[PDB]
Design a protein around this ligand. Sequence first.
Ligand SMILES: [Hg+2]
Ligand SMILES: [Hg+2]
Ligand SMILES: [Hg+2]
Ligand SMILES: [Hg+2]
Ligand SMILES: [Hg+2]
Ligand SMILES: [Hg+2]
Length: 319
Amino acid sequence: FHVKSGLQIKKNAIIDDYKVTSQVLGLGINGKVLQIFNKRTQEKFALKMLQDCPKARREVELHWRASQCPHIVRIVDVYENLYAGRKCLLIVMECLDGGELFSRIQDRGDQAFTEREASEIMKSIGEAIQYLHSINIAHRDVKPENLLYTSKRPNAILKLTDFGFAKETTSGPEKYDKSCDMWSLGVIMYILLCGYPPFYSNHGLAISPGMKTRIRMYEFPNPEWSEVSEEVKMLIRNLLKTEPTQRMTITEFMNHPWIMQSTKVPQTPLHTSRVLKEDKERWEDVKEEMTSALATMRVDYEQIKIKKIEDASNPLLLK
Ligand SMILES: [Hg+2]
Ligand SMILES: [Hg+2]
Ligand SMILES: [Hg+2]
Ligand SMILES: [Hg+2]
Ligand SMILES: [Hg+2]
Ligand SMILES: [Hg+2]
């Protein structure tokens, strides 16, 4: 391929390069993307603040090395500065003002979301994951808050952000990690096709979706209503959720007719806009629930650290 420059965390102050309002800087302590403007170009730009440290710097290394895909937001500058008393890892990103994916769909006069758009979109998102996954990165937080449009007007591009759980799928960790992305793709494509999450149960114990991956007990909408969703559209959204060992591969997904020969799939108008519009709250409810589902599925590692203190050989000494 093409050797590209390594990441170099600029150490100088950030405010002599971008107009961090040093006011506005304040709302960014919990990690909410704020806005800055480059000084000698006065350009756009986003800023996400993180507590500097290995585990914040690992993910920023990760996202940095995946700026490449046109389907991944672009990080333009990384700064390691001293803000207040702490040590801040300030990451400047290309700004995406086009919208949050479902926040676009949700609001349509009546344009109506059509299955082929549902497919075009799934190739987009599947593009990103197919990128990330070939360079051994597992994103593991692919959810609606993280899929944003670039511009606003037409021709807009869809890219994923927030790599704060992104991990290196390389050493069961190949499969398991990777599969939190496949599951998310099964969960997004179902809400995209129905307007509802695959979080309904009629059978037994209404085990939650997160826990459902550690097993126990997914059902689809009334065959007639909006379940107009092809039985080929049903198998793929089902293969993408089974978590066991017979889990799908992003190549498998991308090697799918519906995916690959997309923009040829029928333009079956769908109920997605209506549902998300009709209860803006149960949509917020759905969102929390996928966040949660994700947090309960992710498995992470950690080193063992034992405390040490000196052995008291003679409690009567000068010590
Ligand atoms: Hg940290
Ligand atoms: Hg790419
Ligand atoms: Hg910070
Ligand atoms: Hg922005
Ligand atoms: Hg994307
Ligand atoms: Hg998983």
